Amino acid sequence: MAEKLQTTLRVGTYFRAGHVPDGMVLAQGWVTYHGSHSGFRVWSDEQKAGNTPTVLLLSGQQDPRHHIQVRLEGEGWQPDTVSGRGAILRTAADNASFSVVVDGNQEVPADTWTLDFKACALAQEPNSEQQKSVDIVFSSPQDLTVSLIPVSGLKAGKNAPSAKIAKLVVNSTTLKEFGVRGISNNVVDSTGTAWRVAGKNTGKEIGVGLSSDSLRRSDSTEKWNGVNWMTFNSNDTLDIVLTGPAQNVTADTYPITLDVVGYQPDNQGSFLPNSEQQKSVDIVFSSPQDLTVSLIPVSGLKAGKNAPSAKIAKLVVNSTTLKEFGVRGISNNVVDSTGTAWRVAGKNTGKEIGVGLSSDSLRRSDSTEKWNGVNWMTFNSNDTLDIVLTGPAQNVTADTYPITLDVVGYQGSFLPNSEQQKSVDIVFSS
């Protein structure tokens, strides 16, 4: 005696909030009743006014003040004047079709509207009905607001394990969940939660991905056109870190790029591509600087006859942590063993001058030590040394002379290799 109706009801997924044309199908449905009957009736509890019994006004979930108006259509369906609620079909065919459709050209905001409606059969001149709830979703690019923040002050060289390199924060008041994948020529896990990135200048690769604690905040893993996506509750934060063991990172800028899409869960989940956002930020791995080094050219040098030991440049090696540093000139022709005097060629003329530490600036050196088989004159840091025209008076052609130093920190009879090379130009002027 208990034989009951069978509805199928397929809703749309890709609805973009905004303007919708009247007649736009939102759902398609079929009812199937095999017993004795003379028609079908589908109706709602969300109905509008007793005289338009086909029309429905729907209040949104995110905020009940959002409104969409729909109507029960179908070929052969006419309004149920008898009840005042719903639409009726007349046929003894066991199977009939019907559509739900926006009524009136409207502007629909971004929300989800529950459309719970009811279906039953009519006997030959109540029996057993079916009830279904189902959500229409309208989505917009602004549904979830995303922010990807690069971490400040990373240093090159070997980094800490799982070093935090970005922060993804996703917020939303419309959508309940979101999925995220990296975008890279080289992803290394099925879910796109770990990939590799090339530095813009070097081309060297680092391995990045989601932190071990961000991965555990995922509600589920979904397929979307064959690709695995991890899903997360919106209004949460995921951390992008340096995956795997501790990396040795070349000093460079690395671009990480994320694919973020809204997800509407359902025990039948769907992704909302209208809500999708891709964002890219640059992560800077700067090189670590034990020795702050400032080399500054003297200003107002003029071509022609110059003074013996005339000051050309001033170098100041300031270190907050290390006391003694060594120094050498870099050139194709150094004139003494210690590397403290050498010769520099003009860019435009290519004629050279003799530059070097001033005699006064020498013998402020603590010692002279051996590193790499070459000798370095050590000094005390936070002292300032001056570069000068070495030896006799010099007649310098007006040109720009690139001076280049090589400084290393030393004290302890060893030299730590955060040596730096800095190079300024010196201008002579007719």
Residue numbers in the entry: 21 to 145, 156 to 297, 299 to 441, 447 to 466
What do the authors report?
In order to obtain the atomic detail of Saf pilus, we engineered a recombinant ternary complex, SafDAA-dsc, to mimic the pilus tip. The structure of SafDAA-dsc was determined to 2.8 Å resolution by X-ray crystallography. The SafD, SafA1, SafA2 and SafA3Nte have assembled into a thread-like shape with 26 Å in diameter and 136 Å in length/height. In ASU, three SafDAA-dsc molecules with an extended ‘I’-like or a curvy ‘L’-like architecture can be observed. In the ‘L’-architecuture, SafA2 swings ~26 Å upward with its central axis in 90° angle with the rest of the structure. Structural comparisons among SafDAA-dsc structures show that: (1) The overall Ig-fold of SafD and SafA subunits is strictly conserved; (2) The relative orientation between SafD and SafA1 is also conserved. In between SafD and SafA1, Pro20 adopts a cis-configuration, enabling a kink in the subunit-subunit linker loop that, in turn, allows the formation of intra-molecular hydrogen bonds. In comparison, Pro20 in between SafA1-SafA2 adopts a trans configuration, allowing SafA2 moving freely away from SafA1 as observed in ‘I’- or ‘L’-like architectures. Three SafDAA-dsc molecules form two sets of dimers (i.e. the Type I and Type II dimers) in a parallel head-to-tail configuration. Consistently, the structure-based mutations, which target the dimeric interface and the proline reisdue (Pro20) in LoopG-A, consistently disrupted the self-associating activity of SafDAA-dsc.
